[PDB]
Structure 1
Amino acid sequence: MPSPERLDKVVDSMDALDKVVQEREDALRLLQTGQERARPGAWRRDIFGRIIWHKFKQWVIPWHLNKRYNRKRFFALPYVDHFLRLEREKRARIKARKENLERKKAKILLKKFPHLAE
């Protein structure tokens, strides 16, 4: 391609323009109502027991009349607690491994370069 950087420049410029417009819209929304988000949402537990940010959709009938919305479950039964604990323990194992590896790397680096100690 003759000038590939032109495409990158155009993409960056369009991203900047969209950023400016969205910033103006966000400032106006904060001034008029104060909502930090343009789309309604909520914090709910799914069937798997993890907190999720559910983004609301738009319908024509209220939620209690809706069939598909009512079929979806937003509560977790007690059998997911053990799996949540297992996930937490797995994350703890990964974090501990990362920390120990970082400490080992620091010790090896100090051994190899004495003037880091000095």
Structure 2
Amino acid sequence: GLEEFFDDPKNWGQEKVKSGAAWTCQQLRNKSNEDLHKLWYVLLKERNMLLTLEQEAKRQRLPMPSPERLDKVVDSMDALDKVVQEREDALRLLQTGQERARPGAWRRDIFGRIIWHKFKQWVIPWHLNKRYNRKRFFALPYVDHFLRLEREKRARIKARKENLERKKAKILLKKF
């Protein structure tokens, strides 16, 4: 129930609730899938409790008892997500040989930049799709000058960063 959104009533106002170390990614790799599913839900209920407590601390203009608990539960579930995604990535690379889960393509644009178009899910094919054929994956010849000017600006910024690098080095060698 909602008593699981709140803490233990004996911890209310205890100014510090001790804790334990966040789950390390190697330990989560040692555990199996089903246990990682169940631990995901255990950690989810703990994170909901901690977020509820932090918002009520803000409401009452009092410090949260121990925010390290919220930080460590976020790290624990990030590590769990990492472990499960590594296992799926390994199986996908083994079975299909594809290194991404979503299809996509390197394409050009109406602006002449090369982008990674991530694919969308459709029911009709692309030649019959209206909106898709309204989009332009090609740059007509009036984009090349703006591409050249964009490259030149990037060169003007890099040359500045590297000259300052050398000026700063000489000022350091002036002092020491």
Unmatched segments (≥5 aa) in structure 1: 114-118
**How large is the Cα RMSD of the aligned pairs?**
0.3
| Offset at residue 14 of structure 1 (A) | 0.2
TM-score (norm 1): 0.95
Question: How many percent identity over aligned positions?
Answer: 100
* Number of the residue aligned with 1:58: 121
Relative contact order (C-alpha < 8 Å, sep 6+): which is higher?
2
Tell me which protein shows more strand as a share of its residues: 1
Provide the rounded CA distance (Å) in 1 between the counterparts of 2:73 and 2:122. 38
* Number of the residue aligned with 1:116: none
| Offset at residue 45 of structure 1 (A) | 0.5
Provide the rounded CA distance (Å) in 2 between the counterparts of 1:67 and 1:4. 51
Provide the rounded CA distance (Å) in 2 between the counterparts of 1:30 and 1:83. 40
| Offset at residue 101 of structure 1 (A) | 0.2
| Offset at residue 106 of structure 1 (A) | 0.2
| Offset at residue 108 of structure 1 (A) | 0.4
* Number of the residue aligned with 2:137: 74
| Offset at residue 50 of structure 1 (A) | 0.3
Unmatched segments (≥5 aa) in structure 2: 1-63
SS at match of 1:93: helix
Larger Rg: 2
TM-score (norm 2): 0.64
Provide the rounded CA distance (Å) in 2 between the counterparts of 1:29 and 1:43. 21
SS at match of 2:143: helix
| Offset at residue 94 of structure 1 (A) | 0.1
| Offset at residue 64 of structure 1 (A) | 0.1
Runs of 4+ in structure 1 displaced over 4 angstroms?
Answer: none
| Offset at residue 57 of structure 1 (A) | 0.2
Give the length in aligned residue pairs. Answer: 113
SS at match of 2:84: helix
Deviations 1:29-73 (A, max 9, x none): 000011000000000001000000000001000000000000000
